Design a protein around this ligand. Structure first.
Ligand SMILES: OC[C@H]1O[C@@H](O[C@@H]2[C@@H](O)[C@H](O[C@@H]3[C@@H](O)[C@H](O[C@@H]4[C@@H](O)[C@H](O[C@@H]5[C@@H](O)[C@H](O[C@@H]6[C@@H](O)[C@H](O)O[C@H](CO)[C@H]6O)O[C@H](CO)[C@H]5O)O[C@H](CO)[C@H]4O)O[C@H](CO)[C@H]3O)O[C@H](CO)[C@H]2O)[C@H](O)[C@@H](O)[C@@H]1O
Ligand SMILES: OC[C@H]1O[C@@H](O[C@@H]2[C@@H](O)[C@H](O[C@@H]3[C@@H](O)[C@H](O[C@@H]4[C@@H](O)[C@H](O[C@@H]5[C@@H](O)[C@H](O)O[C@H](CO)[C@H]5O)O[C@H](CO)[C@H]4O)O[C@H](CO)[C@H]3O)O[C@H](CO)[C@H]2O)[C@H](O)[C@@H](O)[C@@H]1O
Ligand SMILES: OC[C@H]1O[C@@H](O[C@@H]2[C@@H](O)[C@H](O[C@@H]3[C@@H](O)[C@H](O[C@@H]4[C@@H](O)[C@H](O)O[C@H](CO)[C@H]4O)O[C@H](CO)[C@H]3O)O[C@H](CO)[C@H]2O)[C@H](O)[C@@H](O)[C@@H]1O
Length: 717
């Protein structure tokens, strides 16, 4: 096969963007290991203090919290969410057909790992090392560096692993320990051995198994109804697992000896129109096969020839049941990559619609580009730029689309250039700066006043704190790929450097690139992108993601850039990321009927809303209205979104259950978003509607007619 984890470029972004150091630094990071602190990772909370020390880090199926002060002894808190809490909102006609508005997990101390040495002292925390799949966390006694616990925190771990060094183990819970079986022997208050089956008084019953892997055994006294203290400082590894069911005690016994410490990810493409990525787990020893929990989308795409599936399942924070897999290597295949490039698969519109489309195109090209592309911020500017990039696109590929008008094609391309040029020269309202701390490019607007910013970290949607980089930069990349494809000589060198700095800021696939962090927004274990960046005072529900199509839009743009420059590894990686996105979207975000990964109340909502690591919220960041919530999952409508990502089956289910009732009532621009989505299953009804209703600010009527008129099953109504 051919390798996808290669650098895009090694251009030094300092030649284009003024350099800064991010004002908000990582408090708990080993500054002396040469690694880059990730801005949008599941490990990101670990690097900063949080309010009440309640910022969760979720390797899944365990959720962890550091140093939260309930239960007295600070340490590492574990929660394992067997059950979820549904909450609802006060009913309004803004959202008519809903009963479950949000799903959350209870912040409860299922079990804490600490020390009796830390009764009157608060331990110093540090992130000693990290990669994409893991982080090692050390809690040590202040001013006594040789007394510490190391926690290798790794995606999917079946146990919590704690390397104690010169400290006295203590295990507290918020529940009561009703029973304790040492070394499988059954009445006492002091216990001895290397295995401890403890059971709690919660609902449902949580059962934990504790393993002592060090040279000496452990001696635990039941101090409270909630605490097990050891006899003396212990040196060695202690592991704790939740027993999902009684018939898996032997499985946990067999795998107690081997722990993950990290993982290396690689990716290949093949000439069978496919691609794959592989996770090679880093372990401590190889004396036993590795046990690891996998997400629903892992089970359906893994190559089964080097792993054994088990029946052991625990609930994840928000992605449904995870299933343990046995093995040290995972190869995940996507055999069906997207065929989409610049246009719909049928590039030519129904012949009865050409005069109508050409009339609308002519109107849309006559628009005032300055007022529709020089918006207050980069985001809305990008929507305008891409929407006009589409019009120049279809007009200058008239040999395929049949929208012939050489004069209009050239004006479309000129006006697009004029409007895009200020962004290429970094002379827009909100110019970018290159950040040496976190190795990315950030908008200037959210920076403090001393760097030319507005002091508001929420300016530009949090882009200065690395939020929504793929939403924003997706539009500019699509635009530039279209300009560079239609006219490869226009500002070629600055264009190639500028566009690739953007692709690299979001999607650098290789540490060999010294200037950009690796995979800022993509997460290879979760199989989708994250939007939430640096969240001062903690991201108390972990990373978040709202828009899927806007993430799709960056990976489509990356792919188009790959087509416009002849870069096969870039084109192939973008495809693979689009294929994983599609699979995971239908596992977790856009729920068909019978979805196994959510409570039925949530499934009837059809979209998850805003998705976080620790909760899901049927709402938006800009208004709790049904057409906003479903509409945001429907723009920008591109050939990628129309031909590949949004499937007839889902569009159809969603339309019969939610949108059919509301799209025709809608009297805002969201009417155009909805009826363009509808053109996917019913172009015959959509086309007349798209002639009348209002357009989204990133949508044009002409392009929308064009995408509808190119559906294969289109007919005059
Ligand atoms: O009231 C008058 C006022 O109203 C405006 O109009 C509305 C219009 O702006 C709205 O536009 C939509 C736009 O918001 C939507 O955006 C998403 C964007 O949400 C997503 O962003 C999120 C961030 O929003 C978010 O930060 C959180 C913050 O929102 C929350 O409120 O508080 C927290 C602070 O304590 C903070 O954490 O963070 C995440 C990352 O973690 C971001 O991803 O990403 C993209 C862009 O970034 C985008 O998809 O986009 C829609 C386009 O699809 C826009 O429609 O639309 C409404 C439609 O009716 C309007 O009401 C007016 O325009 C103004 O003139 C007025 O001031
Ligand atoms: O329309 C007029 C005005 O509407 C506002 O739009 C609303 C929009 O702001 C709102 O979105 C919801 C978010 O506010 C909510 O975000 C929550 C965070 O705010 C909360 O943070 C903190 C935590 O960081 C801090 O440390 O402590 C606080 C107390 O413990 C805690 O509150 O973070 C939460 C996760 O950690 C997060 O939930 O998130 C919701 C998603 O669950 C959003 O729905 O949504 C409204 C309805 O959709 C919007 O109307 C505009 O912003 C205004 O400018 C408008 O004028
Ligand atoms: O009509 C909008 C008007 O009201 C404002 O909107 C509300 C919004 O505030 C609300 O968000 C809450 C989150 O705050 C909440 O988060 C939890 C924290 O509150 C707590 O401190 O910690 C836990 C961690 O365990 C957090 O999860 O989560 C609930 C449920 O997820 C949210 O509902 O959500 C409403 C729905 O969108 C929203 O309408 C807005 O700020 C006003 O300006 C506006 O006028």
């Amino acid at each position: 096969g051919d390798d996808l984890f290669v650098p895009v470029s090694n251009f030094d972004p300092k030649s284009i963007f003024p350099e800064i150091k991010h004002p908000f630094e990582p408090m708990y990071a080993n500054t002396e290991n040469g690694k880059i602190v990730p801005t949008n990772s599941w490990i990101s909370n670990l690097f900063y203090p949080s309010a009440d020390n309640l910022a969760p880090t979720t390797p899944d199926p365990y959720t962890l919290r550091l140093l939260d002060g309930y239960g007295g002894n600070p340490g590492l808190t574990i929660r394992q969410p067997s059950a979820k809490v549904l909450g609802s909102y006060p009913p309004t006609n803004d959202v008519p057909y809903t009963d479950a508005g949000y799903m959350i997990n209870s912040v409860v101390v299922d079990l804490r790992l600490t020390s009796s040495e830390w009764s009157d002292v608060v331990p110093d925390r540090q992130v000693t090392d990290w990669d994409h799949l893991s982080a090692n966390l050390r809690l040590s006694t202040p001013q006594d560096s040789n007394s510490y616990i190391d926690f290798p925190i790794v995606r999917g771990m079946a146990y919590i692993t704690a390397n104690y060094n010169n400290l006295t183990p203590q295990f507290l819970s918020q529940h009561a320990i009703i029973s304790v079986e040492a070394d499988e022997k059954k009445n006492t208050s002091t216990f001895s051995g290397r295995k401890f089956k403890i059971t709690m008084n919660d609902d449902p019953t949580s059962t934990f198994i504790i393993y002592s892997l060090g040279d000496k055994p452990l001696e635990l006294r039941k101090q409270d109804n909630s605490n097990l203290v050891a006899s003396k400082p212990y040196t060695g590894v202690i592991r704790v697992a939740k027993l999902p069911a009684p018939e898996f005690e032997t499985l946990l016994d067999a795998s107690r000896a081997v722990w993950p410490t990290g993982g290396d990810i690689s990716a290949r493409s093949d000439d069978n129109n496919g691609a794959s990525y592989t996770i090679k787990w880093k372990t401590n020893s190889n004396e036993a096969p590795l046990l690891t929990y996998a997400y629903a989308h892992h089970l359906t795409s893994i190559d089964d020839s080097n792993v054994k599936r088990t029946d052991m399942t625990l609930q994840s924070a928000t992605k449904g049941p995870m299933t343990a897999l046995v093995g040290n290597e995972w190869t995940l295949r996507e055999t069906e990559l997207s065929p989409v490039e610049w246009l719909p698969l049928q590039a030519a519109p129904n012949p009865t619609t050409i005069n109508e489309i050409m009339t609308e195109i002519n109107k849309d090209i006559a628009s005032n580009y300055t007022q529709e592309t020089a918006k207050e911020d980069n985001y809305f500017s990008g929507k305008g730029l891409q929407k006009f990039a589409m019009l120049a696109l279809i007009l200058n590929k008239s040999d395929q689309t049949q929208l012939r008008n050489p004069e209009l094609a050239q004006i479309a391309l000129d006006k697009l250039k004029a409007a895009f040029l200020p962004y290429l020269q970094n002379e827009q309202a909100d110019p970018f700066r290159y950040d040496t701390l976190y190795k990315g490019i950030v908008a200037k607007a959210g920076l403090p006043t001393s760097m030319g910013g507005t002091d508001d970290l929420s300016a530009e949607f949090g882009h200065s704190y690395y939020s929504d980089h793929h939403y924003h930069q997706g539009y500019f990349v699509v635009t530039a790929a279209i300009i560079h494809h239609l006219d490869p000589t226009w500002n070629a060198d600055r264009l190639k450097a500028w566009t690739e700095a953007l692709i690299r800021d979001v999607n650098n696939a290789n540490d060999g690139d010294e200037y950009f962090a690796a995979f800022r927004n993509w997460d290879w274990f979760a199989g989708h992108s994250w939007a939430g960046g640096i969240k001062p005072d903690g991201a108390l529900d972990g990373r978040d993601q709202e828009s899927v199509p806007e993430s799709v839009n960056f990976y489509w743009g990356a792919k188009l850039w790959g087509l416009a420059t002849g870069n096969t590894p870039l084109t192939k990686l973008a495809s693979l990321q689009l294929a994983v996105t599609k699979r995971t979207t239908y596992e977790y975000f856009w729920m068909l009927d019978g979805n196994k990964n959510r409570p039925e109340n949530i499934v009837r909502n059809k979209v998850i809303g805003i998705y976080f690591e620790q909760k899901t919220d049927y709402t938006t960041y800009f208004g709790r209205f049904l057409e906003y919530i479903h509409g945001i999952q429907q723009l920008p409508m591109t050939p990628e979104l129309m031909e590949y990502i949004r499937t007839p089956e889902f569009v159809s289910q969603e339309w019969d259950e939610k949108l059919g009732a509301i799209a025709p009532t809608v009297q805002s621009p969201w009417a155009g978003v909805l009826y363009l989505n509808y053109a996917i299953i019913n172009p015959a009804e959509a086309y007349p509607a798209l002639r009348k209703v209002q357009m989204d600010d990133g949508q044009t009527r002409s392009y929308s007619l064009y995408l509808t008129a190119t559906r294969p099953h289109f007919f005059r109504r």
